[PDB]
Design a protein around this ligand. Sequence first.
Ligand SMILES: *[C@@H]1O[C@H](CO)[C@@H](O)[C@H](O)[C@H]1NC(C)=O
Ligand SMILES: *[C@@H]1O[C@H](CO)[C@@H](O)[C@H](O)[C@H]1NC(C)=O
Ligand SMILES: *[C@@H]1O[C@H](CO)[C@@H](O)[C@H](O)[C@H]1NC(C)=O
Ligand SMILES: [Ca+2]
Length: 204
Amino acid sequence: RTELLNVCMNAKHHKEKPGPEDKLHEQCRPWRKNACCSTNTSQEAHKDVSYLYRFNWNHCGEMAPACKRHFIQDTCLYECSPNLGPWIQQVDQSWRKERVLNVPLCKEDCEQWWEDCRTSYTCKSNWHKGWNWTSGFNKCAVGAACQPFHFYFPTPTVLCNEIWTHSYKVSNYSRGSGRCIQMWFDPAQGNPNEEVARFYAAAM
Ligand SMILES: *[C@@H]1O[C@H](CO)[C@@H](O)[C@H](O)[C@H]1NC(C)=O
Ligand SMILES: *[C@@H]1O[C@H](CO)[C@@H](O)[C@H](O)[C@H]1NC(C)=O
Ligand SMILES: *[C@@H]1O[C@H](CO)[C@@H](O)[C@H](O)[C@H]1NC(C)=O
Ligand SMILES: [Ca+2]
């Protein structure tokens, strides 16, 4: 555990520095200029490990567009943020890229994600493991009943903390405090997570 600021973990589980965003992640607009989902300077083998065109958000029927928007933000933060270094667990190489633990997600990001997913459906509370991937995309395992989102995630805390097995630990702090990570931002007005990484690098 060395470099914590402006750093990435790639799909081969080596640390790397960020760079200009790649074409696959074009919709991840906040990270266009400085991203861990970056172009490569060498002829590294091309294999997309992104969830953007891989994960089946509609495993229990149509996910409401408002819910999907949060999942896009979530995916973009995980795949592109160069400000998660303080939470990277380097011994764990079992995720598609970095394993992060207890990232202090801003209160608003979590509560509104939970609200906006009220009318969507899912079949499990931990989305990292346990899917049936034989069709190429993930489907619910046999016996895993589709239910309203709040059946499996009864509070915002349960959603944000459990969905990716403690990747997030929702904060009591809110946006603008410099003490929590937000899932999206306007880049022309500045990346607020840079300050947040600095704060926790000094504490962790
Ligand atoms: C660049 O290399 C990385 C690391 O292997 C890989 O994940 C990515 O798919 C490559 N980029 C392209 C252009 O596919
Ligand atoms: C996975 O899905 C396929 C059908 O696409 C099915 O044959 C198989 O039994 C499923 N396995 C589980 C564990 O649900
Ligand atoms: C959250 O809890 C921490 C630790 O107890 C405390 O320092 C801080 O004042 C709290 N922040 C808010 C916004 O409640
Ligand atoms: Ca960021």
